[PDB]
Design an enzyme around this catalytic site. Structure first.
Site, PDB file in Angstrom:
ATOM      1  N   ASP A 183       0.770  -1.249   0.000  1.00  0.00           N
ATOM      2  CA  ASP A 183       0.000   0.000   0.000  1.00  0.00           C
ATOM      3  C   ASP A 183       0.806   1.306   0.000  1.00  0.00           C
ATOM      4  OD1 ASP A 183      -2.691  -0.366  -0.462  1.00  0.00           O
ATOM      5  OD2 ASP A 183      -3.128  -0.959   1.611  1.00  0.00           O
ATOM      6  N   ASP A 184       1.563   1.495  -1.074  1.00  0.00           N
ATOM      7  CA  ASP A 184       2.376   2.694  -1.276  1.00  0.00           C
ATOM      8  C   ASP A 184       3.234   3.031  -0.045  1.00  0.00           C
ATOM      9  OD1 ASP A 184       0.392   2.643  -3.455  1.00  0.00           O
ATOM     10  OD2 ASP A 184      -0.829   4.016  -2.268  1.00  0.00           O
ATOM     11  N   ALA A 185       3.460   2.036   0.813  1.00  0.00           N
ATOM     12  CA  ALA A 185       4.258   2.225   2.016  1.00  0.00           C
ATOM     13  C   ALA A 185       5.721   2.037   1.689  1.00  0.00           C
ATOM     14  CB  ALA A 185       3.837   1.253   3.100  1.00  0.00           C
TER      15      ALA A 185
END
Ligand SMILES: [Zn+2]
Ligand SMILES: [Zn+2]
Lengths: 24, 342, 48, 49, 101, 40, 304, 98, 68, 337, 44
Positions: free
Chosen positions: J39-41
Site C-alpha cells: 500500500d504505497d508504504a
C-alpha cells in the site's frame, strides 16, 4: 539538434568480490 | 491474521476490562494484580463488593502481593454477599475489541477484531485483506479503538459483527475481503507450472505459514503430499502446495472441494497448449490453472467465496491469513522487481 | 426542527410511548434492533 | 454502570405538559429576586441566582 | 540452568512424541535456518521447518515430525548437537589454512 | 436455511446500500443523473 | 548422511589475507549455514562502543545530541575480549566500575591566532585548535585500567576522523562512558566495515564459439573472464570468480542462445572488511564459535 | 493535443502543457465540487431505523405500523444468496453441501 | 551537518577523507571519480557520501556571538 | 545532514540551491520483500537511521513577560520560602541553565509577585521534552527593569516509523517497518539497501522519472559526475534508458541497472537480479498527528458528564451520528448501550 | 559572570534592577551564556 553528449573517459569502476583494480 | 488487530504496548497497559472474580479465573486475576498497572498482563484496579475502587498505582510488590490473595474473601455485609470483587485487568488477546474508521458509511466500516498484543509498536497493526472494508490505505490515516465493557457486549462483537461475519456486503452480495498488491503478483507466480520444489523447501514453506499451534491443526500432526515427480529428482509443484494447505485445513470429515472457474490470464501469454487460463479445483485439489485476484480477491464464485458457501466464513477467512504469510514468504525468498527491461 | 416538533407534542399532550429507536436513545432503553427484539428468562428449578 | 447494580424499575411512556404556577411554587426550594449573585467576598447571595 | 529459553507448545504435540512444536526466545532465522537444515539430515524426520509468528517478538517456532523410532525430542538433539559438531569442523579447516597462509 | 433472520433492521441497512455507492457519482459522463436525481 | 562424510569432503581456501580484511571460499557447505555466519559477524560479535556521554559543557555549533550520537559511532581499537559486560539490573553507581566500562573525555578550547598571515582563509592559522579530530579523544584510565590497558592504550581506529569544528570563544569538554555490545542492537557495535558473500557464478557454453565469435564473446565480460584458446580458437571460462553478472552477453543476440548464467549453490565467496577493533580472521573465529555455543546452550536446557 | 510521445521515451513541451490541463481536471472536479451525503443517509436511517423483520416475517416500523409483508417479497438474505441458484457448483460437492 | 562519520550502508568510516578529498580536487586537480577511488571509496554508497557533501558548517561559523 | 543531488536539474546551480540544501542522495530499493511495504508504504534500514540517516531537529520559541497591566513582576527568587526543587531546573536569576532537559510540568522561569508575596513559576507545556538553546532577554527604550524574555528549545526528531518521505516524483509513502540491517537483502556487490519502495506503487502511479534517476545516479557517482536532468534534453531518439544504461555497462554493472541480490534470511540468490539505484530523497516534516491518545477515564463536563475533546488532556473519542447507525445496522443494541 | 551582550559580545553581570542593557553599546539586547554544567546523553 545536438545529441545529449556523453562525457568521455568512462572506465571500469567495479570488479568482483575480493579483487583489485589492476587486473586491466 | 485477518480477523486480528495489532495491539501496541502503550495501549493495552491503559485499557482495562472489568472481569468478575471467581474460581475459574482466580488463578489468572491473582497473577495479574501482582504485575500491577505497568507490566503486561495485569491490572490497575480492584472493585470490592461495595463498589469501592482500589488503585494499585504507586504500589509495589508487598501491598499488591497481599491485596492479591484477598480475592476470595467473604462478605462483611450480608446485603452484598451475592457480589464478588471485580478486577480491572489489562486487555489480553483472549478479549475482543472494536475497530472503525470514519466516516462510517456501511456497517463494514465498524467491525470487531481479535486481540493480539505486539510489543514494540507505536501504532496499531492491521492485515491487508481488510482494506476492502474500512476503506484503508496506510498513508497517515487514523482509526478509533473501542473496548467492550460487559460480557454481553463482547458477545456481540464476537458473533454478530466481528470480522468474518461480513464477507459479503449488504449492497449486492459480493465479497469485500480478498487480497492486494504483493499478494496477487506473488500468488500466481508460485502457482505457474514453472514452480518446482524439493522436500526441504516443500516442508519449510508448508510450516512457515501453516502453524500447528495456531487455530488450525485439524489433527495433532501435519499431513503431506506424495511428490508429483519421483525419479530422478523428487519434486513437488506449487499447485500442490495449495492442495497441501487445503487438506490440512478443511474439516477432515468433509469431501474435498470441487470447483469450475477461470482467471484473468488468456491462454495466450502462456504459450501453445497451455490451459492455465482455466482453473479447475476438484476434490480439495488444484488440478489446473493459476490463481488470481479473481480467486483470492473480492470476486464472487472465486475459490475464496466458493469455500465460503461450502465450508463457512471461518475456515475460509483463516485460509486467507495463512496464505498471506506463505505468500509474503515465497516473496522474501525469490523477490519481485521491475527494471528498465520491463 | 427540534423546537417546533416539541410544540407538536405539548399541544397534543402526546404520548411518546418510547418505541422508535430515536425515542429510546434519549432514555437509553435498549433498541428494538435484533438483540433487542426478544428477551431473556431463567429456567430455575426448586419453585414448587 | 456495573453488572451488579441492576434495577427492575423502568419508565414505559413519556408525556409532555405545562407547568402550572402551583406545582412550581410547591416544589421550588427557594424564590429568586436579587440580581447580584455574590456578596463582597465570594458567597451565595440570599435569594441570589 | 535456564528454563524459559526453550518451552514445548503442548497444543500441537501428540502423546507419542513423533510430533511436537517448541517456542524459543532470543533467536531468529540465523539459528532457525541452520538448524532446520540439520534436522532434515535425520532419516527419521518426516517433517520439519521453522516459523516466526511475528518479527516484533523474538520468538522462534520449530515443528518436527518423525516416523516413530525417535520422537521430537531426540531428533532435536541429534541435530542440535550435530550442528556444533559441524561448525567445529569448519573452524579447524579454516584454522589450518590461516596458519599455513 | 438461506432466509433472512427475524430482526435485521433492513431499513437502516438499506440507507447504507444507498449512501455508500452515491460517492462514486462524484464525476460526470439526455436526462437528470447522479446526486441530484436522487435529491428529486 | 554423516558428520564424517562431511568433514572429509568440506573444504576452505583463503584467497587474500590482510590486516583490514580478507578473501576466501567455503565449499561443500549449505547456503543456510553460511548465511548464518553472515548475520553473526555483523550482528552478534561484540565490540567496544560509547554509550552514555555526559556533557560537562558545549558551546560549539554542533548541538549536543548530535555531538553525542557521533562519537558513539567512532571506531574503537580495543580488544573487546579485555572488558566485561554490564548488568542492566543494578542502579547507575553499581552498574559502572573499572573492569566494567571504559572512560574517555575530550577538552578543547579554541581561540583566535593574532599571528595569522594577515590574509589567510584557512582556519588553522587564523584560529587555534579550530578543528577537532578523533586523535583528540582522550583516554582516562581507571584503577584496574592503569595496568590492564597499560600496554595497549585506547585510540580510535581512524585518527583523522574529523569530529567537531568551531571558531574562537567556543569549547568542548565531556567525558563519556563506553562498553561492549553487538550490531543486532545499535550498528555502532558492528565490528565490520561490512562483510558478505556471493554464490560463485557458473558460466557454461552450449556449443563451441570459435573464430571471430571468440574475440566478440570474450569482450562481453570483465577482463580475463573469457580467455581465448590457442589453435582451437574457441573461448572458455578462466575464473568465474571475476564475473560481475553484468549479463552482458545476453544482450547481443547471437550469444543469447550459446550459453547460460547459473549458480554453484555450495561455493561461497566471502569478503570481510573491519572497523579496526578486531582483525578479520578473528571476527570469523568468534562467529563460528558463536553458533557452536548458541547450540550447546540449548543441549543443556530442559523443557517446560 | 495528440500525444505523439510516450511516458518511457519523452513527451514534448507542447504535449506536457496540455497534459497539465488534464491532471488538474479530476482534482478540480473532486475537490471544487465536494457535496457530502451526510443528510441523505440521516434522511433515510433516522426515519427507517426501526424498520425491521418481525417474528411473523413482516416488515414493520417500531410502532407496529406495517410497510411490507415480506422482505424482498421473498424474504431472502442478501448474502445467503450468492450460490442459491448456482445449481452447477451445487450438484458438485452435493455430499459436502448436505 | 558536517561530514557524516561512517558510511550509510556499510559503516565504513568516512568522516576523515574529507580534508584529503578537497586537497585532491584542488592541488592534484583530479576528477570527482578518480579522487574518490584512491581515497578508499569503492562501493557507490560510500562514494556517494563524500561526492555530495555540504560542509555547510562553515556557513554557520560566520555567525559567532563571541566577537566584533 | 545534507548533500548536492547526484541527479541535478542544472538550473539548480544557477539558482544556487547548494547554499540551502534540502535532500540527501539515498540508496533506493525497487522491490517487494518484507511484505510490509505494500500500500504505497516504504521501508527504512534501522542501521541507517542510527548511522544518521536524515536525522532532523525541531526548534520552538516561547516568550515570557507578565506585562498584562505600575510594575510588580520581577524575575528571580523572592525571600518567601519557595519549594526549592526549582534551584535545579533553574539558575538564581530566574532563567534556566543553558542546555537543560525539560518536559511538561518542568520549571522554566522564576519571578516574584509583590502583590502576591509568593514567588511563582511559568512552566513548560508541550507533550514532549526539549533542551535549551537560546537565551533571549531585552529591555525597553532605558532602564525599564527586565520584563521581556525568551529562548529556544531543541527537540529531537529522529526519523520515526510514521513521518512522511518522498522523492521529487510524487512518491508519497509512510514508513511501516524499520527493518534490521541483518534481515535486509544484501547485494552481490555487498550493499544493504538504504530505502525500500515497492514496485506495486508504480503501475497505477506512472512516475517513470524515478526509474531514470536511478541508473542516472548510480553511474555518475561511480564515475564522478553530476548527471544533467533538466527537462527535454532527450527525445524519442536518444533516450535515457540507453545513454545511461551504457554508462553503467561501461562502468561494469549490468546494462538496465540490474543487480544480483540475496535474501538476508534464506541467503540464496533471489530470483531476478532486482534493479536498484540512487535517488535524491526528501524527509517530510512531521506533518502527522501521530499522537494517538487513549482514554481510560479523565476530564468530563459540568453540564453533560460526558468527557470533552482534548488529545493533550486525554479527551474521549467521539461516537458521532454516523457510527450510531453502523451499530444500529448490525443489530447490536448492547454495543450501542 | 553569568551574562553576555548579543551585540558587542562584552561579558558582564547584572545587579538588582540594573541597566537591562549592555554597559558598553547600549544595545538593549542581551543573552545569558552557557554555564559549565551537565546533561545526561547517549549515542542513539
Ligand atoms: Zn558504503
Ligand atoms: Zn553591547
Amino acid at each position: 539538434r545536438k545529441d545529449v553528449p556523453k562525457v568521455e573517459g568512462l572506465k571500469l569502476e567495479h570488479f568482483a568480490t575480493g579483487y583489485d583494480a589492476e587486473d586491466f | 491474521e485477518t480477523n486480528e488487530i495489532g495491539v501496541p504496548p502503550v495501549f493495552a497497559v491503559k485499557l482495562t476490562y472489568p472481569e468478575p472474580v471467581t474460581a475459574y479465573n482466580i488463578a489468572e486475576l491473582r497473577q495479574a494484580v501482582i504485575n500491577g498497572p505497568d507490566k503486561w498482563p495485569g491490572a490497575t484496579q480492584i472493585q470490592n463488593e461495595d463498589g469501592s475502587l482500589v488503585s494499585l498505582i504507586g504500589m509495589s510488590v508487598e501491598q499488591r502481593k497481599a491485596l492479591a490473595n484477598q480475592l476470595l474473601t467473604p462478605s462483611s455485609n450480608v446485603s452484598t454477599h451475592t457480589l464478588n470483587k471485580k478486577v480491572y485487568r489489562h486487555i489480553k488477546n483472549r478479549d475482543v475489541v472494536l475497530m472503525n474508521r470514519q466516516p462510517t458509511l456501511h456497517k463494514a466500516s465498524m467491525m470487531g477484531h481479535k486481540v493480539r498484543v505486539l510489543p514494540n509498536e507505536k501504532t496499531l497493526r492491521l492485515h491487508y485483506a481488510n482494506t476492502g472494508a474500512y476503506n484503508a490505505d496506510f498513508d497517515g490515516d487514523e482509526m478509533n479503538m473501542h473496548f467492550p465493557q460487559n460480557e454481553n457486549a463482547r458477545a456481540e462483537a464476537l458473533n454478530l459483527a466481528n470480522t468474518d461475519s461480513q464477507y459479503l456486503t449488504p449492497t449486492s452480495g459480493s465479497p469485500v475481503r480478498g487480497l492486494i498488491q504483493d499478494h496477487i503478483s506473488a500468488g500466481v507466480w508460485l502457482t505457474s507450472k514453472d514452480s518446482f520444489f524439493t522436500r526441504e523447501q516443500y516442508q519449510q514453506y508448508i510450516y512457515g505459514c501453516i502453524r500447528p499451534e495456531d487455530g488450525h491443526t485439524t489433527r495433532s500432526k501435519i499431513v503431506t503430499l506424495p511428490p508429483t515427480i519421483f525419479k530422478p529428482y523428487p519434486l513437488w509443484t506449487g499447485k500442490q502446495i495449495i492442495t497441501t494447505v487445503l487438506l490440512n485445513v478443511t474439516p477432515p470429515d468433509m469431501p474435498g472441494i470441487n470447483l469450475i472457474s477461470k482467471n484473468k490470464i488468456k491462454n495466450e501469454y502462456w504459450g501453445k497448449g497451455s490451459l492455465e487460463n482455466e482453473v479447475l479445483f476438484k476434490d480439495g485439489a488444484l488440478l489446473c490453472g493459476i490463481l488470481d485476484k479473481s480467486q483470492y480477491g473480492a470476486s464472487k464464485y472465486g475459490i475464496v467465496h466458493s469455500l465460503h458457501e461450502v465450508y463457512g466464513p471461518e475456515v475460509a477467512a483463516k485460509v486467507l491469513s495463512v496464505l498471506g504469510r506463505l505468500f509474503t514468504n515465497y516473496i522474501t525468498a525469490t523477490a519481485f522487481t521491475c527494471g528498465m527491461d520491463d | 426542527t427540534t423546537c417546533q416538533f416539541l410544540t407538536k407534542a405539548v399541544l397534543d399532550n402526546e404520548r411518546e410511548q418510547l418505541d422508535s429507536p430515536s425515542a429510546r436513545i434519549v432514555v437509553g432503553k435498549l433498541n428494538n434492533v435484533g438483540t433487542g427484539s426478544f428477551d431473556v428468562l431463567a429456567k430455575v428449578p426448586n419453585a414448587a | 454502570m456495573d453488572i451488579s447494580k441492576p434495577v427492575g424499575s423502568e419508565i414505559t411512556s413519556v408525556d409532555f405538559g405545562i407547568l402550572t404556577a402551583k406545582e412550581i411554587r410547591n416544589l421550588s426550594a427557594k424564590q429568586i429576586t436579587n440580581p447580584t449573585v455574590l456578596d463582597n467576598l465570594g458567597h451565595p447571595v440570599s435569594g441570589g441566582l | 540452568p535456564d528454563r524459559e529459553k526453550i518451552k514445548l507448545l503442548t497444543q500441537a504435540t501428540s502423546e507419542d512424541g513423533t510430533s511436537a512444536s517448541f517456542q524459543i526466545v532470543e533467536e531468529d532465522h540465523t539459528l532457525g535456518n541452520a538448524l532446520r537444515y540439520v534436522i532434515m539430515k535425520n532419516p527419521d524426520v518426516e517433517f520439519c521447518g521453522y516459523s516466526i509468528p511475528h518479527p516484533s517478538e523474538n520468538l522462534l517456532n520449530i515443528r518436527i515430525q518423525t516416523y516413530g523410532e525417535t520422537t521430537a525430542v531426540d531428533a532435536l538433539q541429534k541435530g542440535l548437537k550435530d550442528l556444533m559438531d559441524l561448525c567445529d569442523v569448519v573452524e579447524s579447516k579454516f584454522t589450518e589454512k590461516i596458519k599455513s597462509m | 436455511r438461506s432466509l433472512i433472520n427475524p430482526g435485521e433492521a433492513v431499513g437502516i441497512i438499506a440507507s447504507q446500500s444507498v449512501g455508500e455507492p452515491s460517492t462514486q457519482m462524484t464525476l460526470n459522463t439526455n436526462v437528470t443523473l447522479g446526486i441530484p436525481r436522487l435529491r428529486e | 548422511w554423516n558428520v564424517e562424510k562431511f568433514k572429509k569432503d568440506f573444504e576452505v581456501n583463503i584467497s587474500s589475507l590482510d590486516a583490514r580484511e580478507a578473501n576466501f571460499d567455503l565449499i561443500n557447505i549449505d547456503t543456510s549455514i553460511a548465511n548464518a555466519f553472515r548475520r553473526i559477524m555483523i550482528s552478534e560479535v561484540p565490540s567496544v562502543a560509547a554509550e552514555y556521554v555526559y556533557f560537562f559543557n558545549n558551546t560549539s555549533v554542533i548541538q549536543d545530541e548530535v555531538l553525542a550520537h557521533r562519537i558513539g559511532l567512532v571506531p574503537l581499537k580495543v580488544d573487546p575480549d579485555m572488558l566485561t559486560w554490564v548488568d542492566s539490573n543494578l542502579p547507575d553507581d553499581e552498574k559502572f566500575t573499572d573492569e566494567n566500562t571504559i572512560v574517555l573525555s575530550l577538552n578543547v578550547k579554541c581561540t583566535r591566532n593574532p599571528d595569522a598571515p594577515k590574509g589567510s582563509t584557512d582556519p588553522k592559522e587564523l584560529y587555534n585548535n579550530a578543528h577537532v579530530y578523533a586523535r583528540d579523544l582522550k583516554f582516562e584510565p581507571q584503577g584496574r585500567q592503569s595496568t590492564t590497558f597499560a600496554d595497549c592504550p585506547v585510540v580510535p581506529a581512524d585518527p583523522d576522523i574529523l569530529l567537531a569544528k568551531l571558531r574562537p570563544g567556543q569549547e568542548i569538554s565531556l567525558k563519556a562512558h563506553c562498553i561492549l555490545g553487538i550490531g543486532g542492537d545499535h550498528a555502532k557495535f558492528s565490528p565490520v566495515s561490512t562483510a558478505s558473500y556471493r554464490l560463485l557464478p557458473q558460466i557454461n557454453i552450449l556449443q563451441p564459439i570459435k573464430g571471430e565469435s571468440a574475440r566478440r564473446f570474450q569482450k562481453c565480460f570483465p577482463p580475463g573472464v573469457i580467455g581465448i584458446d590457442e589453435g582451437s580458437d574457441e573461448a572458455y571460462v578462466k575464473d568465474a570468480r571475476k564475473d560481475t553478472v553484468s549479463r552482458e552477453v545476453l544482450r547481443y543476440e547471437e550469444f543469447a542462445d550459446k550459453v547460460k548464467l547459473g549458480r554453484v549453490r555450495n561455493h561461497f565467496i566471502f569478503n570481510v572488511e573491519s572497523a579496526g577493533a578486531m582483525t578479520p580472521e578473528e571476527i570469523f573465529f568468534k562467529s563460528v564459535r558463536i553458533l557452536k555455543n548458541k547450540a550447546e546452550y540449548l543441549k543443556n536446557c530442559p523443557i517446560t | 493535443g495528440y500525444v505523439k510521445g510516450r511516458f518511457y521515451s519523452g513527451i514534448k513541451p507542447q504535449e506536457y502543457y496540455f497534459h497539465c490541463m488534464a491532471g488538474r481536471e479530476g482534482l478540480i472536479d473532486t475537490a471544487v465540487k465536494t457535496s457530502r451525503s451526510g443528510y441523505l443517509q440521516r434522511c433515510l436511517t433516522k426515519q427507517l431505523e426501526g424498520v425491521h423483520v418481525s417474528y411473523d416475517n413482516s416488515i414493520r416500523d417500531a410502532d407496529g405500523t406495517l410497510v411490507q409483508f415480506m422482505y424482498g417479497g421473498d424474504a431472502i438474505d442478501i448474502t445467503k444468496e450468492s450460490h442459491m441458484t448456482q445449481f452447477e457448483f451445487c450438484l458438485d460437492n452435493y455430499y459436502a453441501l448436505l | 551537518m558536517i561530514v557524516p562519520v561512517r558510511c550509510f550502508s556499510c559503516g565504513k568510516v568516512v568522516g576523515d577523507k574529507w580534508e584529503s578529498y578537497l586537497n585532491l580536487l584542488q592541488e592534484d586537480e583530479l576528477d570527482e571519480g578518480t579522487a574518490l577511488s584512491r581515497l578508499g571509496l569503492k562501493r557507490y554508497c560510500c562514494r556517494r557520501m563524500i561526492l555530495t557533501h555540504v560542509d555547510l558548517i562553515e556557513k554557520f561559523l560566520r555567525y559567532n556571538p563571541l566577537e566584533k | 545532514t545534507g548533500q548536492t543531488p547526484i541527479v541535478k536539474a542544472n538550473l539548480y546551480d544557477d539558482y544556487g540551491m547548494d547554499n540551502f540544501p534540502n535532500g540527501f542522495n539515498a540508496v533506493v530499493a525497487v522491490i517487494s520483500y518484507t511484505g510490509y511495504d505494500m500500500d504505497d508504504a516504504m521501508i527504512i534500514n534501522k542501521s541507517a537511521d542510527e548511522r544518521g540517516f536524515g536525522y532532523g531537529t525541531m526548534y520552538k520559541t516561547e516568550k515570557v513577560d507578565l506585562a498584562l497591566n505600575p510594575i510588580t513582576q520581577h524575575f528571580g527568587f523572592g525571600n518567601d520560602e519557595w519549594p526549592k526543587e526549582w534551584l535545579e531546573k533553574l539558575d538564581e536569576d530566574g532563567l534556566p541553565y543553558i542546555g537543560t532537559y525539560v518536559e511538561e510540568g518542568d520549571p522554566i522561569c522564576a519571578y516574584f509577585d509583590d502583590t502576591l508575596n509568593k514567588t511563582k513559576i511559568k512552566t513548560y507545556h508541550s507533550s514532549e521534552p526539549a533542551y535549551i538553546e537560546e537565551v533571549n532577554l531585552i529591555g525597553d527604550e532605558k532602564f525599564q527593569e527586565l520584563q521581556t524574555v525568551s529562548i529556544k528549545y531543541r527537540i529531537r526528531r529522529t526519523p520515526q516509523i510514521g513521518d512522511k518521505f518522498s522523492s521529487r516524483h510524487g512518491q508519497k509513502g509512510v514508513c511501516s517497518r524499520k527493518w534490521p540491517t541483518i534481515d535486509m537483502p544484501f547485494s552481490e556487490t555487498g550493499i544493504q539497501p538504504d530505502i525500500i519502495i515497492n514496485p506495486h506503487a508504480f503501475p497505477s502511479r506512472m512516475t517513470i522519472g524515478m526509474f531514470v534517476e536511478s541508473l542516472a545516479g548510480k553511474a555518475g557517482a561511480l564515475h564522478g559526475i553530476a548527471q544533467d536532468s533538466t527537462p527535454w534534453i532527450f527525445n524519442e531518439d536518444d533516450t535515457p534508458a540507453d545513454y545511461f544504461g551504457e554508462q553503467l555497462a561501461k562502468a561494469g554493472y549490468n546494462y538496465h541497472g540490474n543487480e544480483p541480490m540475496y535474501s538476508g534470511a534464506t541467503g540464496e540468490e533471489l530470483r531476478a537480479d532486482i534493479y536498484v539505484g540512487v535517488v535524491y530523497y526528501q524527509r517530510l516534516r512531521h506533518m502527522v498527528n501521530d499522537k494517538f491518545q487513549v482514554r481510560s477515564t479523565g476530564p468530563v463536563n459540568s453540564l453533560t458528564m460526558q468527557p470533552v475533546k482534548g488529545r493533550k488532556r486525554h479527551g474521549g473519542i467521539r461516537v458521532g451520528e454516523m457510527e450510531r447507525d453502523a451499530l444500529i445496522g448490525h443489530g447490536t443494541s448492547f454495543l450501542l448501550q | 559572570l553569568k551574562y553576555i551582550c548579543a551585540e558587542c559580545s562584552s561579558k558582564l553581570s547584572l545587579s538588582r534592577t540594573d541597566a537591562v542593557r549592555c554597559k558598553d553599546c547600549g544595545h538593549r539586547i542581551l543573552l545569558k551564556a552557557r554555564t559549565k554544567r551537565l546533561v545526561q546523553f547517549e549515542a542513539r
